[PDB]
Write a protein that binds this ligand. Structure first.
Ligand SMILES: [Mg+2]
Lengths: 544, 1303, 29, 117, 11, 33
C-alpha cells in the first residue's frame, strides 16, 4: 500500500505513510531502550509523549502540530489524511476509479451519423476494443493465438480494420464528458469507425451532454460484460435519453443550427414567388423549388395529411406553407399531432414542445427518427439559406442617437442644483437603467419589420434577428448588449455604474466603457468558475 | 518601416496615438533582475535594492564568544560558464558563479586593547554559487525546457484598515480591522469587536487587548490618553457657577446643564446648532459660561490622585486636589496594568507552551517587532505606511516604530466613524507586484540567513587566528535556495513558449498565487475581480478561464513596475486645457488624487475642444470638464495586455469572449509559412520585435550572405576600428520549445540589403516579415454548412490542409536513460532479443534511430538492454523454449519506443555519455559527426571573418596596381610606416579575435570529448528529438483570433466548399450563431476588414501581374495605403507580399469604426453590405441571402487532437491502489469519478458500475479474468472484492478500527 | 423523467433528483 | 557506488502540477502487476500447450507434462519424472527429446511459431 | 494554556 | 465503494432475483425437512 518503488533516476519514491511508520518505529525503539536503560522519569514520560504524538500524526496528522517530513516541506499525509481528500476512498481510491478500457478524444460534429451512433477514431477503436478484436480474430480464425493477434493489431494491419468494423456493430460505448451534472452525461452510442482521431458526436445529443464542439474531450468507455454491453443499449443509449431527467422537456431538441434551419423554413411572408400555387405531393414542393418557381419563404399551398382524428385521415388540401411542409412530412402520422404544431414560427421553445409532443403522444422510435430527420433537414435548409452574420445583420436603431441625447440632457437638468445619491439614482436608474430598454425595444421593433423591396417582395429577415427569435443563440439581453445600449456595467460591490455608457459592440467602444464592461463581466466569468464549485459541492451532497 | 513594414505596409486606423512609445514587453523582468544583479564595476555596485543589500545585511556577522567578525567588501560577478545556446542542449543550469570578498579580523583583543597580532584583515574570497543569469529574452534557463519566473502580486507591506462588510458582526455593525502587513515577519491585527474595543490580534492567533501591546512599547497608562483626551476648564465650589471654560464643542448637543454667560447669559435650552453662541463666545473674549458629572476623567492625574478613572461622585476631596470612546474602554477591559504583565501575555499568545519570563517575554516582543533581523519590513512598506498614515521620514528604518503603532491606532479610531476612507485590501496600488528579481532576492536572503546561522555555529569551533580563508562558510544552502526556486517553485513552475506572444504574456504575467500570496483556493470572489485602479496597469480581459481566474492576470502593455514594486502605468500629463507632452508613470497609489481623462478624445491642434471629456478622477469614471485635467491616457491599448492588444476590433468583442480570445493568442502553435494577419494590429510588430526567438540587427551594416543556419552582417556604416567588427546572427533552427513545439527562424533579409540597427532580421516561430503571426489567414464563411459547424465547431476546407498552411512541427524530443541498475550495468546496444527485424530498422550500430529516419508510433527508438535476474520460470514458457531450442533471455526489454502518434521523422538524436567512459563503443559516429559539423561551422565563421577583414583592409589601404599584388594584406611593401603600423595593429587585434573564437571552440570540443554533464546514476543519455508534421485533422482546436474557438469539423475537399463569386472556395466555414450568443461581433467586423484586405491584395497582385512596377500601381497603393512612397525598388517586392491581402494595423480601441470598414469595402471593390454572394459547394446553388465571406485570422491552438486523444484498454497500473494510471502519460485510463459514476448510478446501469469500478480497474484478480473471458469469446465476468476496497480496509485496519468482512 | 412511462422499480430516484438539482448549477446566482 | 545511493526518497504524495492534485503516487507505474494481456497469453499458452500435447502419446504426454508441470506445479527432474512411468534411466530423456523434436514441424508447431517472439 | 506541542511541553 | 452490484437499476433487479431465488431455495429446503 505504501510502496518504495525505484523511480527512474535511482531516487526511490517512498509513500507518505512509510515516513510516519518509520518515525513511530523510531519512537518505540527509543522508548524501549529508555525503559530497559532505566532513564530519568521525566525522559521516559517525555519519550512516551513523543511516541504518542508520532502515533497521532501517523493516523490523522491534523490534530497535532502537522509534523512535516524531514526531506520535503509538504504536510505528510496519514491514514486519516488519505481518506479525507480526493486521493483516498473519497475520490481517488473507490469512487473515482481510473477505469481502463477508456478513451479521451476531442469531439467533432457528427451530422452524417444517426442519433444513436457516435464517431469513434480508428486509432482509438483498436486500443479500446483490443480484447474484442482478439476475440473476433480468434473466432473468425484469422489469428492462431492471442500473441499473434496482439502482433497483428499492434502494427495496425489492413486485415484487422475489417474486423474492427465488424466487432463494433451493436457494441455501445459510454460517452463520458469531462463535467457531468446529470445521468445524461454518460450516454452509450453505437460507435462508427470514422476517419481522423476525433469522436464524431451527434449534434442533437451534445446539448444533453453539455458538450459544445469548441474543445470538449468526451471520455469514451467500452462495457466489457455481455450485460454491460447490453445495459448500454437498453438504458444508456442516446435514443432512450431524449427527455432530460430534470423535467418533462426533451433534451434532444436542436440547440443552435437545426433550430435556425427550422425557423428559416417556417418563416412565412405574404410576398414571395408562387403565391397560392397548389401542389400535389410533398415532392412537388421541392420539384418546383428546384425550378425557381416557388421560393422557401413558406407562402404556397399544397397537400399534406395531418392525421388528427382516429384512424387514417384523408389528404386534405391544407392552406399551409411549403417550408412548414418539409418539417411536417418529418412528423410521424398520429392523432393530436401534424401540421398544427408546425403552424407556429418553429422557434427553439416551439421545436422543443414539438419533440415533446411527438414523444408524449407517439413512441420513442418515431421520436428519435423524427429528431434524426429534422436535424438533417434543418442542416440542409440552413446551409442553403445563407444565415451568415454581417455588418448589416445587427442593425443599429436609427432612433438611438436622439434618444441618447435626450437621456443625457435629462441627466443634466436635475444635476445643476445637486442629495447627491438621489440625483445619481435618477441619472443611473431612470436615465440609463431606464430608456436602455427603450432603445433596445426600438431596435427590436426596427429589426422585426420585414423590409419590402421595390418588387413587392421582402428582401430578407436579419440573421441576428432570426437567431434571437428562434432561440438558437440570440436573446433580448444579448441583442441589447450587441446592438442596443449595452446597459450599465456592474461594480465590485454590486452597484451599477453611473457614467454614461452609450455604445454597442457593433460600434467602437472607447477604453473606459470597455474597461467597465470587462469589470462587470469578469465577475460573472468568475461566478462561472467559482459558483460552479458550489454547484459541484451541492450536487455531491445531494447524491450522497 | 525599419525593414519590417516596408514590405508589409499596414494601413493604420488609429486617430493620432503618439503620446509615449510603449516600453519593452520583457522589460519588467529585465529591469527587475537588473536591480538584483548589477554586473558592473565597483561604483555601479551601489544599490540599496537587490542581492547586494540583502547580502551586506546578512553576510557581516559577529561572534559574542570569540569576537570574530566576517566583513563584506563587495562581490564580483563572473561570466557564465555555459552559453544559453549551449545550456539549452546540455539541460544544465545557465548560471554564473558568485564571488564575494571576505575580511576576517581579530583586532578586538582582551586586556583592554583594540588591536591584536592578526588585527589586519585577510581579504578572503569564497565561491558563493551559481545564479541563473537572466537571458536577453528573459528565460532563466535552469535546465532543459527553460522556465521563466512569473511575477507575483502579494499584499504590499504597510498598515491596512479592512472595514468589515457586516460578516462576523454582532447584529450589523462593522469591524474595521486595522492590520499592518509586514514584508517579512508576523502580521498584526487591530480589529474591533461588538463591545467597541480594539484587540491586537497578532497573526490571527489570539485576541489580547491593545493595552498589552501599548505596554510592550512603554507608552501606555497615564501617557497613552494624552493624544486622546485633555484637561477641561472646570473650577471648584464658589459663588453661583464659576468656571473658566471656553465654549468650542457645545454645538449640536442638547443643553444638559445651564451653561449661560456670566453677565447676560447664553446657551439657550434649545441648543439647535450653536452657530450664534460660538460666535458670541469667540467675540466676547472667551466663552465664559456659568453652569458634567458622569464623564470620563482619565486625564493626567500620586499624593492626591490615584490610578484609574471611576469616581461616580461629586468631586470629593476637592476633586483630587461621542467621537472618541475606544482608548478608555480598552484600558479598563485589560487585566494587565504593568508592562511586565503585557510582555507575559504577549509571550503566552506567541508561545503558550513555553513558560513566560520577565526578560524572556520582553526579548520575544523585541525580536518579533523591534528587531530588524526578523521583522524585515521593506522600504516599500515604510513608504506605503507614510502615505497611508502621515509620519516622518522613515525610509531607513524598517521595523514598526513605537510611534507608528500610536498613529495607526489613532487613524483606526478616527476611521471607525468617518474621518477618512478605509484602505481597500483589493487595490492594485495596494497590491504591489513582485517579480523574479524580488522573489529571488528574498529567497537568497533566506539562504544567506541559513548560511549565517551555519557560519555562527561553525566559527565557535574553528579559531579565527591562522585559519584557512573561507573555510567555515558553506555553499550548499546558497545554491540550494536558488535550485528550489527554479526546480519546484510555484512561480517557476513552467514557461509557456508556444510562440513569441506566449513568452511575452508569460513573462508579463502577474500571478497572485504561489509562495508569499494567496493560493488558488485562498483567492475567493474578492481578489478574482478587477479593481478600478487596474485600468492601464493590468489587463482585465486576458486572464485564464480555469480556477485561477483573476489571479494570473497579465500586466498591461504600457504598465511598468516602479522601484518600490507598485505597477506604474504611463499617463500623458496635461495642463489646463492644453495637453502637454510630459509623461510620468503614475502609480496606482498616487493616481487617486490625480484626475485622469481617457484617450480617444477629439483634441484640437493645441488643446482639447470637447469641454466634456470622459475619464475617472479616482477609479469611478465620470464626465470631467476640459479644465481640471492633469493626467491623460497615453494610448487606448494601455488597458489591454500584450496578448490582448493583438485582438483586432477588441472594442467590439465582449468583455467575456475577449478573455477567451486573448487567452488563445498565447495558445497558438507556430505554423510553417505563417503570415501576418491582413486585419492584424500594430501591436503585433512591437510584440514580435520585443520578444524572443527573433534576431534583431545589432548593427547598421548591410547583410553579406544568408544560408538559413546563419546570417552575416557588415559592421556598420560608421564602425569603430576594432570594437566588434562584423556581427553574425546564428539563426536558431528547429529546436524543441518548452511546449514541445517548433522554434524556427527564417532570414527575411535578402542578400545585399542594408538593414539599420534595432530591427528584426529573421522572423521567429510563427512570424512573417517581422510582424507576429500566430497563424495563417484563411477565407472564412460564417454560415452553418450542413451542420458540420452546428456547435462552436469550425468547418474546414481541404485547401487549408492541402497547401500546408496550418501545419506545425511539435518536436517531441523524447528522453531515454541508461542508468546502471543494481543487477548489472544497463546497456544501450542495438536491440533487445525477442524483437522482430522490422522494428530494428532505422537504427545505427549504437542502437539509436538514425537522424532523419521516420519512426512510426510504437517503433523502437533506442534499444535499452537492462540486465536483471532470472524471471519467474513458468512451466508452459519453459516447455515452449525447450521446443524452439532458444534460451531464456536474462535481460528484460526496456528499449524506449514512441507513444501512439504521428511523430514519424527524427530531427536530432543527442547522446550524453558519462565522463568516465564516453564514446568507447556507443555513439562514436554521433560525436564524430558532431565534431565534423562544429569544425565546419568554425571554418565558415573564420572564412567570413577573414573575408570581411580583407575587405576592410583593402578599403583602408586604397585611400592610403594593387590587383597584381594580392599578398600585400599584411605588408605595405613600401616606405610607409604609419599606415603599415595601423594595419598591423588592426590585423593583430583581428587575429586576437580569431584566437578567442578558436579558444572558445576548443573549450567546447574538450568539454564534449571529456563527457557531457550526466546525472549521478545514468551514464549514457540519448535525447532523441522526434518532429511531427501534424496536418489539420478533424479534432484540432482551431480557435479564432477573437475568442470564437471550436474543434475543426470534417475536412471537406476543395470541391465541396462553398464557392465564391470569383470561383475561390473558402478555407473555413464558421458558425454565425456564435456572435449573437457570445457578443463577439468584432469577429464579424474583423472578418469584413480581412475580406476587404484580401480583395485589395487580389486587385494589387492582379495589377502587378500585367505590368510589374507599373506607374498606376503606385497610385492604387497610395489610394489604399503616408509612409508608403519609398525611393527603393522594393515596390515589386511589397506587392508580392500584399497580394495575399494588404495588412492593417488597427488599434485595440482606436481602430476602424463601422464607417471606416464601409469605406474600405467600397474602395476595395467589396459589396457595401459587407457580405458577399457565396455559391454552395456540396450541391451548388446561389444562396438566397448575403453571406459573410472574409479572411479571418484563425489559429492552430496547442490543444490539438493528437496530443489530447487517448485510448488504453489496459495500461500500467498504480501501486497504492492497483488502478490504471491517469492521463495520457503511460496508457492511462479515463478516471470514472464519483460525479461521473452517479450518471450510471441514477441510470439502471448497475452491472456497468459492478464491472467498471469493480472488475475493470481495481481487480488485479478480476481484471485478468475479464480480459481472458473477453478474448475467449464469452462476455462474462466476476469481481467480488476490488483492490480499492482491499487497500481501504487495510488502511482502516492500520488504525484502531476493526473493519472486517463477515458472512 | 426519462420518458413518458411511469417510474419503474430499481431506478436511483434520489440520484436522478440530485443530478436534476445540480444541473441548474454553474449558471445560478 | 557511494554516490547514487538513494540519498532522499521523494514523498509519494508530493504534488505533480501547479496545484496539490494528482500527486506522484497516482502516476507511478507497476513493474510487478501482471497486465491482462500478459495473462491472456498465459491462459492461451495453457490452451495452446494442451492441444499440442493431445497429439502425443498418452503416457508420453503425461511424462512430458510431469517433466514441467501443467496442472501440478511441482517441476520434476528427469529421474523424478522417470520413476513415475518406467525405470528411471536415459529412456525418459530419450522420449523427452523425441517429443521435443516431434512438435517442431509446421503442422504441430504452427500457432507457436509466433508465440515465442 | 493548552500548548498542544511536545517540544514546548518538554522545554 | 465495496465493489458489489449496486442495489439500484439492473443491480436492483438482480438483487430482487437473488432474493426470490433465496426464497425459492428456502421453500425447497422446507420440502425436504
Ligand atoms: Mg463546448
Amino acid at each position: 500500500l505504501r510502496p518504495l518503488v525505484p523511480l527512474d533516476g535511482g531516487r526511490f519514491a517512498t509513500s507518505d505513510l512509510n515516513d510516519l511508520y518509520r518515525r513511530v518505529i523510531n519512537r518505540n525503539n527509543r522508548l524501549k531502550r529508555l525503559i530497559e536503560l532505566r532513564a530519568p522519569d521525566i525522559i521516559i514520560r517525555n519519550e512516551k509523549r513523543m511516541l504518542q504524538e508520532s502515533v497521532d500524526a501517523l493516523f490523522d496528522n491534523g490534530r497535532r502540530g502537522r509534523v512535516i517530513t524531514g526531506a520535503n516541506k509538504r504536510p505528510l499525509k496519514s491514514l486519516a489524511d488519505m481518506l479525507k481528500g480526493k486521493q483516498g476512498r473519497f475520490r481517488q481510491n473507490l469512487l473515482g476509479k481510473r477505469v481502463d478500457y477508456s478513451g479521451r478524444s476531442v469531439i467533432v460534429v457528427g451530422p452524417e451519423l444517426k442519433l444513436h451512433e457516435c464517431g469513434l477514431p480508428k486509432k482509438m477503436a483498436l486500443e479500446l476494443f483490443k480484447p474484442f478484436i482478439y476475440a473476433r480474430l480468434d473466432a473468425k480464425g484469422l489469428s492462431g493465438t492471442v500473441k499473434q493477434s496482439k502482433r497483428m493489431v499492434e502494427r495496425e494491419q489492413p486485415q484487422v480494420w475489417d474486423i474492427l468494423e465488424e466487432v463494433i456493430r451493436e457494441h455501445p460505448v459510454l460517452l463520458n464528458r469531462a463535467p457531468t451534472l446529470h445521468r445524461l452525461g454518460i450516454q452509450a452510442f453505437e460507435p462508427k469507425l470514422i476517419e481522423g482521431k476525433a469522436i464524431q458526436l451527434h449534434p442533437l445529443v451534445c446539448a444533453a451532454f453539455n458538450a459544445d464542439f469548441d474543445g470538449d474531450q468526451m471520455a469514451v468507455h467500452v462495457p466489457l460484460s455481455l450485460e454491460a454491453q447490453l445495459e448500454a443499449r437498453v438504458l444508456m443509449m442516446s435514443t432512450n435519453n431524449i427527455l432530460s431527467p430534470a423535467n418533462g422537456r426533451p433534451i434532444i431538441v436542436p440547440s443552435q443550427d437545426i433550430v435556425l434551419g427550422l425557423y428559416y423554413l417556417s418563416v412565412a411572408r405574404d410576398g414571395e414567388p408562387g403565391e397560392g400555387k397548389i401542389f400535389a405531393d410533398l415532392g412537388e414542393i421541392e420539384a418546383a423549388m428546384d425550378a425557381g418557381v416557388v421560393s422557401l419563404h413558406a407562402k404556397i399551398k399544397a397537400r399534406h395529411t395531418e392525421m388528427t382524428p382516429e384512424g387514417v385521415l384523408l389528404r386534405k388540401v391544407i392552406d399551409t406553407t411549403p417550408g412548414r411542409m418539409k418539417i411536417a412530412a418529418l412528423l410521424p402520422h398520429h392523432p393530436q399531432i401534424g401540421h398544427r404544431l408546425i403552424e407556429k414560427a418553429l422557434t427553439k421553445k416551439e421545436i422543443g414542445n414539438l419533440i415533446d409532443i411527438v414523444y408524449r403522444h407517439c413512441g420513442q422510435k418515431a421520436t428519435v427518427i423524427f429528431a434524426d430527420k429534422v436535424m438533417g433537414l434543418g442542416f440542409k435548409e440552413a446551409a442553403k439559406a445563407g444565415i451568415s452574420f454581417g455588418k448589416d445583420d445587427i442593425i443599429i436603431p436609427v432612433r438611438k442617437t436622439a434618444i441618447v441625447e435626450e437621456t443625457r440632457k435629462l441627466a443634466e437638468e436635475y444635476e445643476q442644483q445637486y442629495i447627491t445619491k438621489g440625483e445619481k439614482y435618477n441619472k443611473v436608474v431612470d436615465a440609463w437603467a431606464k430608456a436602455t430598454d427603450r432603445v433596445a425595444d426600438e431596435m427590436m421593433a426596427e429589426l422585426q419589420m420585414k423590409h419590402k423591396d421595390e418588387n413587392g417582395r421582402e428582401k430578407e429577415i436579419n440573421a441576428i434577428y432570426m437567431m434571437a427569435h428562434s432561440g438558437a443563440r440570440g436573446s433580448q439581453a444579448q441583442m441589447k448588449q450587441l446592438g442596443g445600449m449595452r446597459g450599465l456595467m456592474a461594480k465590485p460591490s454590486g452597484e451599477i455604474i453611473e457614467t454614461p455608457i452609450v455604445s454597442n459592440f457593433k460600434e467602437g467602444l472607447t477604453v473606459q466603457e470597455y474597461f467597465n464592461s470587462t469589470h462587470g463581466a469578469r465577475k460573472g466569468l468568475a461566478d462561472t468558475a467559482l459558483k460552479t464549485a458550489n454547484s459541484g459541492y451541492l450536487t455531491r451532497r445531494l447524491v450522497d | 518601416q525599419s525593414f519590417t513594414g516596408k514590405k508589409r505596409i499596414r494601413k493604420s486606423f488609429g486617430r493620432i496615438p503618439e503620446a509615449v512609445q510603449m516600453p519593452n514587453l520583457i522589460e519588467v523582468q529585465r529591469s527587475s533582475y537588473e536591480q538584483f544583479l548589477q554586473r558592473e564595476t565597483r561604483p555601479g555596485l551601489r544599490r540599496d535594492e537587490g542581492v547586494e543589500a540583502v547580502f551586506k545585511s546578512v553576510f557581516p556577522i559577529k561572534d559574542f564568544n570569540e569576537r570574530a567578525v566576517l566583513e563584506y567588501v563587495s562581490y564580483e560577478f563572473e561570466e557564465p560558464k555555459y552559453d544559453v545556446e549551449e545550456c539549452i542542449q546540455r539541460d544544465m543550469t545557465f548560471a554564473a558563479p558568485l564571488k564575494v570578498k571576505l575580511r576576517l579580523i581579530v583586532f578586538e583583543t582582551e586586556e583592554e586593547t583594540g588591536a591584536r597580532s592578526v588585527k589586519d584583515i585577510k581579504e578572503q574570497d569564497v565561491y558563493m554559487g551559481d545564479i541563473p543569469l537572466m537571458t536577453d529574452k528573459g528565460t532563466f534557463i535552469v535546465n532543459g525546457t527553460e522556465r521563466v519566473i512569473v511575477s507575483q502580486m502579494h499584499r504590499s507591506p504597510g498598515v491596512f484598515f479592512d472595514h468589515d462588510k457586516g460578516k462576523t458582526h454582532a447584529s450589523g455593525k462593522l469591524l474595521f480591522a486595522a492590520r499592518v502587513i509586514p514584508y517579512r515577519g508576523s502580521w498584526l491585527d487591530f480589529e474591533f469587536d461588538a463591545k467597541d474595543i480594539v484587540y491586537v490580534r497578532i497573526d490571527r492567533r489570539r485576541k489580547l487587548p491593545a493595552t498589552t501591546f501599548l505596554y510592550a512599547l512603554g507608552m501606555d497608562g497615564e501617557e497613552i490618553l494624552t493624544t486622546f483626551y485633555d484637561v477641561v476648564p472646570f473650577e471648584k465650589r464658589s459663588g453661583g457657577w464659576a468656571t473658566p471654560y471656553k465654549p468650542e464643542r457645545w454645538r449640536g448637543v442638547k443643553p444638559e446643564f445651564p451653561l449661560v454667560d456670566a453677565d447676560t447669559g447664553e446657551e439657550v435650552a434649545p441648543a439647535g446648532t450653536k452657530i450664534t453662541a460660538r460666535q458670541a463666545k469667540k467675540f466676547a473674549d472667551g466663552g465664559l459660561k456659568t453652569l458634567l458629572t458622569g464623564r470620563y476623567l482619565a486625564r493626567d492625574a500620586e499624593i492626591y490622585a490615584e490610578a484609574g478613572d471611576e469616581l461616580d461622585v461629586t468631586s470629593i476631596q476637592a476633586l483630587a486636589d461621542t467621537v472618541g470612546a475606544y482608548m478608555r474602554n480598552t484600558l479598563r477591559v485589560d487585566k494587565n496594568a504593568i508592562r511586565e504583565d503585557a510582555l507575559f501575555d504577549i509571550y503566552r499568545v506567541m508561545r503558550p507552551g513555553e513558560p513566560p519570563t520577565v526578560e524572556a517575554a520582553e526579548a520575544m516582543f523585541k525580536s518579533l517587532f523591534f528587531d530588524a533581523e526578523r521583522y524585515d519590513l521593506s522600504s516599500v512598506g515604510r513608504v506605503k505606511m507614510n502615505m497611508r498614515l502621515e509620519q516622518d521620514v522613515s525610509d531607513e528604518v524598517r521595523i514598526l516604530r513605537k510611534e507608528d503603532v500610536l498613529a495607526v491606532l489613532k487613524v483606526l479610531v478616527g476611521l471607525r466613524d468617518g474621518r477618512g476612507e478605509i484602505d481597500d485590501i483589493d487595490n492594485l496600488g495596494n497590491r504591489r507586484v513582485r517579480s523574479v528579481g524580488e522573489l529571488l532576492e528574498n529567497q537568497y536572503r533566506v539562504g544567506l540567513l541559513r548560511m549565517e546561522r551555519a557560519i555562527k555555529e561553525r566559527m565557535s569551533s574553528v579559531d579565527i587566528d591562522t585559519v584557512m580563508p573561507h573555510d567555515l562558510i558553506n555553499a550548499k544552502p546558497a545554491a540550494a535556495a536558488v535550485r528550489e526556486f527554479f526546480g519546484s517553485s510555484q512561480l517557476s513552475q513552467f514557461m509557456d513558449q508556444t510562440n513569441p506572444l506566449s513568452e511575452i504574456t508569460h513573462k508579463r504575467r502577474l500571478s497572485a498565487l504561489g509562495p508569499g500570496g494567496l493560493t488558488r483556493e485562498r483567492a475567493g470572489f474578492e481578489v478574482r475581480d478587477v479593481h478600478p485602479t487596474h485600468y492601464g496597469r493590468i489587463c482585465p480581459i486576458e486572464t485564464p478561464e480555469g480556477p485561477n481566474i483573476g489571479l494570473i492576470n497579465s500586466l498591461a502593455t504600457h504598465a511598468r513596475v516602479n522601484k518600490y514594486g507598485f505597477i506604474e502605468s504611463p499617463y500623458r500629463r496635461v495642463k489646463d486645457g492644453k495637453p502637454q507632452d510630459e509623461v510620468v508613470y503614475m502609480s496606482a497609489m498616487e493616481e487617486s488624487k490625480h484626475v485622469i481623462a481617457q484617450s480617444n478624445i477629439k483634441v484640437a491642434e493645441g488643446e482639447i475642444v470637447e469641454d466634456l471629456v470622459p475619464g475617472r478622477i479616482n477609479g469611478e469614471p465620470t464626465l470631467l470638464q476640459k479644465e481640471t485635467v492633469d493626467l491623460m491616457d497615453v494610448s487606448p491599448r494601455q488597458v489591454v495586455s500584450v496578448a490582448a492588444a493583438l485582438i483586432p476590433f477588441l472594442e467590439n468583442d465582449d468583455a467575456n469572449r475577449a478573455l477567451m480570445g486573448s487567452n488563445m493568442q498565447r495558445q497558438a502553435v507556430p505554423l510553417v509559412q505563417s503570415d501576418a494577419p491582413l486585419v492584424g494590429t500594430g501591436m503585433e510588430a512591437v510584440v514580435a520585435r520585443d520578444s524572443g526567438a527573433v534576431v534583431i540587427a545589432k548593427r547598421t551594416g548591410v547583410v553579406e550572405q544568408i544560408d538559413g543556419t546563419r546570417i552575416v552582417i557588415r559592421a556598420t556604416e560608421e564602425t569603430d576600428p576594432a570594437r566588434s567588427g562584423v556581427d553574425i546572427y546564428r539563426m536558431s533552427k528547429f529546436q524543441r520549445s518548452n511546449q514541445s513545439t517548433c522554434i524556427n527562424q527564417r532570414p527575411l533579409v535578402k542578400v545585399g540589403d542594408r538593414i539599420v540597427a534595432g530591427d528584426i532580421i529573421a522572423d521567429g516561430p510563427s512570424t512573417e516579415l517581422g510582424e507576429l503571426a500566430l497563424g495563417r489567414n484563411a477565407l472564412v464563411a460564417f454560415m452553418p454548412w450542413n451542420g458540420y459547424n452546428f456547435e462552436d465547431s469550425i468547418l474546414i476546407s481541404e485547401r487549408i490542409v492541402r497547401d500546408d498552411v496550418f501545419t506545425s512541427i511539435h518536436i517531441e524530443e523524447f528522453e531515454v536513460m541508461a542508468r546502471d541498475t543494481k543487477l548489472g550495468p544497463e546497456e544501450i546496444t542495438r536491440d533487445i532479443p525477442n524483437v522482430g527485424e522490422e522494428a530494428l530498422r532505422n537504427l545505427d550500430e549504437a542502437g539509436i534511430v538514425a537522424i532523419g529516419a521516420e519512426v512510426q508510433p510504437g517503433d523502437i527508438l533506442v534499444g535499452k538492454v537492462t540486465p536483471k535476474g532470472e524471471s519467474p520460470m513458468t512451466p508452459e514458457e519453459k516447455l515452449l523454449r525447450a521446443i524452439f531450442g532458444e534460451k531464456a533471455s536474462d535481460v528484460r526489454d526496456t528499449s524506449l519506443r514512441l507513444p501512439p502518434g504521428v511523430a514519424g521523422t527524427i530531427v536530432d538524436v543527442r547522446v550524453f555519455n558519462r565522463h568516465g567512459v564516453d564514446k568507447d563503443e556507443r555513439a562514436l559516429a554521433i560525436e564524430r559527426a558532431e565534431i565534423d559539423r562544429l569544425g565546419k561551422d568554425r571554418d565558415d565563421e573564420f572564412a567570413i571573418l577573414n573575408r570581411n577583414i580583407s575587405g576592410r583592409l583593402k578599403e583602408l589601404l586604397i585611400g592610403k596596381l594593387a590587383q597584381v599584388a594580392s599578398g600585400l594584406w599584411w605588408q605595405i611593401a613600401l616606405e610607409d610606416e604609419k599606415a603599415m603600423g595601423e594595419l598591423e595593429s588592426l590585423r593583430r587585434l583581428f587575429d586576437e579575435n580569431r584566437k578567442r573564437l578558436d579558444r572558445r571552440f576548443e573549450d567546447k570540443v574538450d568539454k564534449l570529448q571529456r563527457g557531457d554533464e550526466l546525472p549521478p546514476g545514468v551514464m549514457k543519455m540519448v535525447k532523441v528529438f522526434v518532429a511531427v508534421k501534424r496536418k489539420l485533422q478533424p479534432g484540432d482546436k482551431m480557435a479564432g483570433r477573437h475568442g470564437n474557438k471550436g474543434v475543426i469539423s470534417r475536412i471537406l475537399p476543395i470541391e465541396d466548399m462553398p464557392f465564391l463569386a470569383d470561383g475561390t472556395h473558402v478555407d473555413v466555414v464558421l458558425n454565425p450563431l456564435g456572435v449573437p450568443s457570445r457578443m463577439n461581433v468584432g469577429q464579424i467586423f474583423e472578418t469584413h476588414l480581412g475580406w476587404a484586405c484580401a480583395n485589395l491584395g487580389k486587385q494589387i497582385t492582379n495589377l502587378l501581374e500585367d505590368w510589374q512596377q507599373g506607374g498606376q500601381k503606385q497610385a492604387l497603393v497610395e489610394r489604399l495605403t503616408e509612409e508608403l512612397p519609398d525611393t527603393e525598388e522594393g515596390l515589386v517586392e511589397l506587392a508580392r507580399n500584399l497580394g495575399k491581402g494588404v495588412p492593417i494595423a488597427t488599434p485595440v480601441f482606436d481602430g476602424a469604426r463601422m464607417d471606416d470598414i464601409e469605406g474600405h469595402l467600397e474602395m476595395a471593390g467589396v459589396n457595401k453590405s459587407g457580405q458577399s454572394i457565396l455559391f454552395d459547394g456540396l450541391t451548388g446553388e446561389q444562396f438566397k441571402r448575403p453571406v459573410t465571406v472574409g479572411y479571418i485570422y484563425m489559429l492552430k491552438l496547442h490543444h490539438l487532437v493528437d496530443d489530447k486523444i487517448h485510448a488504453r484498454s489496459i495500461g500500467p497500473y498504480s501501486l497504492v491502489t492497483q488502478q490504471p494510471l491517469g492521463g495520457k502519460a503511460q496508457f492511462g485510463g479515463q478516471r470514472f469519478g464519483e460525479m461521473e459514476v452517479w450518471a450510471l448510478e441514477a441510470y439502471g446501469a448497475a452491472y456497468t458500475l459492478q464491472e467498471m469500478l469493480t472488475v475493470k480497474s481495481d481487480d488485479v484478480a478480476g481484471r485478468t479474468k475479464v480480459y481472458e473471458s473477453i478474448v475467449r469469446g464469452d462476455d462474462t465476468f466476476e469481481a467480488g472484492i476490488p483492490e480499492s476496497f482491499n487497500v481501504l480496509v487495510k488502511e482502516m485496519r492500520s488504525l484502531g478500527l476493526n473493519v472486517e468482512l463477515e458472512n | 423523467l426519462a420518458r413518458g412511462t411511469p417510474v419503474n422499480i430499481g431506478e436511483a430516484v434520489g440520484v436522478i433528483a440530485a443530478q436534476s438539482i445540480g444541473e441548474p448549477g454553474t449558471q445560478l446566482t | 557506488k557511494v554516490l547514487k545511493i538513494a540519498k532522499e526518497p521523494i514523498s509519494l504524495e508530493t504534488p505533480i502540477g501547479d496545484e496539490e492534485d494528482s500527486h506522484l503516487g497516482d502516476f507511478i507505474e507497476d513493474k510487478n502487476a501482471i497486465l491482462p494481456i500478459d495473462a491472456a497469453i498465459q491462459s492461451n499458452l495453457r490452451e495452446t500447450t494442451t492441444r499440442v500435447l493431445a497429439s502425443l502419446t498418452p503416457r508420453e504426454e503425461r511424462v512430458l507434462r510431469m517433466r514441467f508441470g501443467i496442472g501440478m506445479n511441482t517441476d520434476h527432474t528427469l529421474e523424478e519424472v522417470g520413476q513415475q512411468f518406467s525405470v528411471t534411466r536415459e529412456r525418459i530423456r530419450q522420449i523427452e527429446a523425441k517429443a521435443l523434436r516431434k512438435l517442431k514441424h509446421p503442422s504441430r508447431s504452427r500457432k507457436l511459431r509466433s508465440f515465442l517472439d | 494554556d493548552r500548548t498542544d506541542d511536545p517540544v514546548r511541553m518538554y522545554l | 465503494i465495496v465493489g458489489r452490484l449496486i442495489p439500484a437499476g439492473t443491480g436492483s433487479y438482480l438483487r430482487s432475483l437473488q432474493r426470490v431465488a433465496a426464497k425459492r431455495d428456502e421453500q425447497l429446503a422446507q420440502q425436504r425437512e
